[PDB]
Design an enzyme around this catalytic site. Sequence first.
Site, mmCIF file in Angstrom:
data_model
loop_
_atom_site.group_PDB
_atom_site.id
_atom_site.type_symbol
_atom_site.label_atom_id
_atom_site.label_comp_id
_atom_site.label_asym_id
_atom_site.label_seq_id
_atom_site.Cartn_x
_atom_site.Cartn_y
_atom_site.Cartn_z
ATOM 1 N N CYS A 81 -11.444 -16.304 -30.858
ATOM 2 C CA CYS A 81 -12.508 -16.486 -31.887
ATOM 3 C C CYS A 81 -13.605 -16.030 -31.534
ATOM 4 O O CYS A 81 -14.477 -16.017 -32.618
ATOM 5 C CB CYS A 81 -12.811 -18.103 -32.182
ATOM 6 S SG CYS A 81 -13.524 -18.692 -30.471
ATOM 7 N N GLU A 119 -5.191 -21.891 -35.617
ATOM 8 C CA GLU A 119 -6.427 -22.454 -35.760
ATOM 9 C C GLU A 119 -7.472 -21.302 -35.371
ATOM 10 O O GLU A 119 -7.102 -20.355 -34.638
ATOM 11 C CB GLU A 119 -6.512 -23.558 -34.603
ATOM 12 C CG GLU A 119 -7.756 -24.296 -34.116
ATOM 13 C CD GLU A 119 -8.596 -23.792 -32.945
ATOM 14 O OE1 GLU A 119 -7.857 -22.846 -32.348
ATOM 15 O OE2 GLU A 119 -9.514 -24.511 -32.774
ATOM 16 N N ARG A 163 -16.955 -30.728 -33.569
ATOM 17 C CA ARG A 163 -16.143 -29.397 -33.462
ATOM 18 C C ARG A 163 -15.267 -29.080 -34.700
ATOM 19 O O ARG A 163 -14.455 -29.696 -35.093
ATOM 20 C CB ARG A 163 -15.032 -29.464 -32.146
ATOM 21 C CG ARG A 163 -14.375 -28.238 -32.034
ATOM 22 C CD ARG A 163 -13.464 -28.312 -30.919
ATOM 23 N NE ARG A 163 -13.155 -27.056 -30.097
ATOM 24 C CZ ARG A 163 -14.031 -26.408 -29.147
ATOM 25 N NH1 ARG A 163 -14.930 -26.990 -28.656
ATOM 26 N NH2 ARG A 163 -13.509 -25.146 -28.724
ATOM 27 N N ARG A 165 -13.363 -26.664 -37.019
ATOM 28 C CA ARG A 165 -12.265 -25.594 -36.926
ATOM 29 C C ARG A 165 -11.443 -25.413 -38.332
ATOM 30 O O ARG A 165 -11.309 -26.302 -38.901
ATOM 31 C CB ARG A 165 -11.472 -25.763 -35.648
ATOM 32 C CG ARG A 165 -12.197 -25.871 -34.293
ATOM 33 C CD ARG A 165 -12.692 -24.519 -34.037
ATOM 34 N NE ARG A 165 -13.315 -24.179 -32.652
ATOM 35 C CZ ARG A 165 -14.622 -24.269 -32.179
ATOM 36 N NH1 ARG A 165 -15.472 -24.487 -33.381
ATOM 37 N NH2 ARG A 165 -14.939 -24.009 -31.164
HETATM 38 C C1 SAM Z 1 -9.998 -19.356 -27.682
HETATM 39 S S1 SAM Z 1 -8.515 -19.876 -27.035
HETATM 40 C C2 SAM Z 1 -7.254 -20.981 -27.370
HETATM 41 C C3 SAM Z 1 -7.245 -22.366 -26.510
HETATM 42 C C4 SAM Z 1 -5.980 -23.052 -26.689
HETATM 43 N N1 SAM Z 1 -5.799 -23.406 -28.114
HETATM 44 C C5 SAM Z 1 -5.968 -24.535 -25.934
HETATM 45 O O1 SAM Z 1 -5.359 -25.248 -26.194
HETATM 46 O O2 SAM Z 1 -6.655 -24.309 -24.759
HETATM 47 C C6 SAM Z 1 -7.957 -18.137 -27.124
HETATM 48 C C7 SAM Z 1 -6.904 -17.590 -25.756
HETATM 49 O O3 SAM Z 1 -6.391 -16.556 -26.148
HETATM 50 C C8 SAM Z 1 -6.338 -15.748 -24.767
HETATM 51 N N2 SAM Z 1 -6.189 -14.190 -25.175
HETATM 52 C C9 SAM Z 1 -6.893 -13.251 -25.670
HETATM 53 N N3 SAM Z 1 -6.796 -12.259 -26.088
HETATM 54 C C10 SAM Z 1 -5.337 -12.353 -25.432
HETATM 55 C C11 SAM Z 1 -4.223 -11.158 -25.366
HETATM 56 N N4 SAM Z 1 -4.339 -9.867 -25.931
HETATM 57 N N5 SAM Z 1 -3.115 -11.598 -24.743
HETATM 58 C C12 SAM Z 1 -3.068 -12.947 -24.601
HETATM 59 N N6 SAM Z 1 -3.972 -13.753 -24.509
HETATM 60 C C13 SAM Z 1 -5.054 -13.525 -24.823
HETATM 61 C C14 SAM Z 1 -7.507 -15.981 -24.154
HETATM 62 O O4 SAM Z 1 -7.596 -15.796 -22.635
HETATM 63 C C15 SAM Z 1 -7.803 -17.362 -24.521
HETATM 64 O O5 SAM Z 1 -7.564 -18.550 -23.591
#
Ligand code: SAM
Length: 327
Positions: A81, A119, A163, A165
């Site tokens: 995000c 989300e 929060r 979303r």
């Molecule tokens: C904002 S959060 C999701 C949180 C999750 N819904 C929860 O229950 O904790 C997005 C996640 O995507 C991961 N991410 C970002 N770019 C990525 C990529 N190219 N490949 C894999 N994971 C990635 C980030 O490290 C981060 O943990």
Amino acid sequence: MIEIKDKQLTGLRFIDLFAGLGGFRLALESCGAECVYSNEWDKYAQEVYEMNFGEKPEGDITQVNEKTIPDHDILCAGFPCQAFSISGKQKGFEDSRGTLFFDIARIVREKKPKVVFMENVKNFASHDNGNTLEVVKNTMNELDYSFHAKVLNALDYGIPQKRERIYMICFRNDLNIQNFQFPKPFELNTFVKDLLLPDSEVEHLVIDRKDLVMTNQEIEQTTPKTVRLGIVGKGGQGERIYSTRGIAITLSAYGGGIFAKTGGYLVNGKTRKLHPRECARVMGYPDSYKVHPSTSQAYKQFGNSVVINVLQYIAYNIGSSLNFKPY
DNA sequence: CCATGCGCTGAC
DNA sequence: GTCAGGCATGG
Ligand SMILES: C[S@@+](CC[C@H](N)C(=O)[O-])C[C@H]1O[C@@H](n2cnc3c(N)ncnc32)[C@H](O)[C@@H]1O
């Protein structure tokens, strides 16, 4: 998180993309679904996920051949995000971290799950004059999915956090689902004060700034809203103090200020930030969830995560719709 | 790697 | 008016 008596997703398989702490896994597993794949590239998130689920997620989804992804009924993705938040630059699809939606699309084209469950931040709905959400809708429609999108606030679903979303639920067209509904809000009966640890456990989190200005009198009556009582410094992000008789501000992953990532709270005459366990609670994580040994990474992880209770109500409704199949 | 003072967007 | 929601540079 809440108890689910009637296991609406029993017999269904899901994948946990951008898994982080596994909030989608806890939500769907509580409704009876089985996880068959998870993907997350952050080293410390992979550690906490392994601690909690017993497996290391696969790394960088952009380099994953979508043919190798196990068959599944539901695809879950809380995708990054930072490129859409009103706290950042809003470069959207121009940001490296902004194009992960098209990896979801790539997987969906190949695997064709029954349901796609996404989300992002509230501002995803308004970003680039609505063109961002528009592109997502159009992508899903051309993949032969319906597209249901609504911004929900956690404070309407039993959790004391402001929060907001967007939640995006897509059903494959051949299923003919016409009765999906977002969960209806209900009255909040839990406030920040209800989730707090004993003072003895959190002494190290107390901050005593000489430039604290207390702007508003503490409240005795609990209220389902944030109630700012004072500020430090110039009153920017992380420089704001709240009543625990209201609800928490949005937890954040990369946030700054002296009360970074949690915000500051008046507790028994002192101002402190939240403990990681209190962050877990404010995100609806059960006390049985094991927090990362780095407190620094723990705050980052909960600030990036999802509110479990909200996903539970939605997942239950997805299951309700899938199971309604009259003659 | 972490800390923290922004800095200005959104939305009222 | 009243407020709440990641980036940059320092170590
Ligand atoms: C904002 S959060 C999701 C949180 C999750 N819904 C929860 O229950 O904790 C997005 C996640 O995507 C991961 N991410 C970002 N770019 C990525 C990529 N190219 N490949 C894999 N994971 C990635 C980030 O490290 C981060 O943990």
